[PDB]
Each structure stands twice: as C-alpha cells, then as structure tokens.
Amino acid sequence: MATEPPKIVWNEGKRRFETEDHEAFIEYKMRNNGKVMDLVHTYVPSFKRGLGLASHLCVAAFEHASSHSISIIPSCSYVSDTFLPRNPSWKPLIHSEVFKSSI
Numbered sequence: 001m002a003t004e005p006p007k008i009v010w011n012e013g014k015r016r017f018e019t020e021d022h023e024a025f026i027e028y029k030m031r032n033n034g035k036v037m038d039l040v041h042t043y044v045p046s047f048k049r050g051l052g053l054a055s056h057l058c059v060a061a062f063e064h065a066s067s068h069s070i071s072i073i074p075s076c077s078y079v080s081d082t083f084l085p086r087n088p089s090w091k092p093l094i095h096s097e098v099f100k101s102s103i
Contacts, residue, residue, distance in 0.1 A: 006053060008060050017060040019053055021045060026057030026076065037065045037093075042076040055083040062090045074098075 007020040018025040024044035028037045039061045044054035058079040065072045072093040074080040081098030084090060095102035 004056070006056065008057065010060075010064075017057050019044070019048070019057065021047065024048060024053055024057060026061055028061045028072075030070070031073070032071075034070070036071040036073055037061055039072055039074040039076045042079050055079040058083070059087075059090075062093060066090065066093055 009018045009020075009022070010016075011018060011025075014027065015029055016025050016027040021044075026042050027040040029040065030036065031038050039058055042054045042058050044051075044057070048054070058074060058076045061074075062072060064070075070093070072090065074094055077098040080094070084094075084097045088096070091101070
C-alpha cells in the first residue's frame, strides 16, 4: 500500500527524513510547542533532481504530521508551490500551497 521504492529514513535526532541515498533529506521542527511542523529544506542529488523524490521528502513530513493530527509550515515551499496544487491533500495541515489560499 505505502511501499515506496525509496527508503526514506527518519532521523529523530536531526528531525529529518533521509532518502535511500541519504544525500537527499528533508528537515523540520515542531513549532508552537509542537503543534506546527516547520518543514525546512528539501534537497536531492543530481540522480533524482526532478524525479519527485525531493517533494516526497516534504510529503513524508506531511504523512507524519497529518497522521498525528499536527499542523505544518513548509519552508520547502518550492514543493508547496508546485507540488501542493498537484496534490492538495495537505491543505488541512498547512496554509494550502506555497503561501496563498490563506491569510
């Protein structure tokens, strides 16, 4: 069901998700005492630049917060701007997209 070809590892020490390559990772921090997850820095090597993986890292933080009923703010908004209009499933977590569709 949720078997991703990539193996995105969670580093709770760095509060980050690292792909099967570990060179691509997504960071975040839980703001407001842990009510809002600030998704910080989506990165991916040359091998998987425009393969979606970078955005999947951002989505991994979505999957984490959504299931735990947490809110999110993506500084990864490169993902948010293009990807979130592509899959508007994470609006209930964040603003909506990069920044718009919000106050």
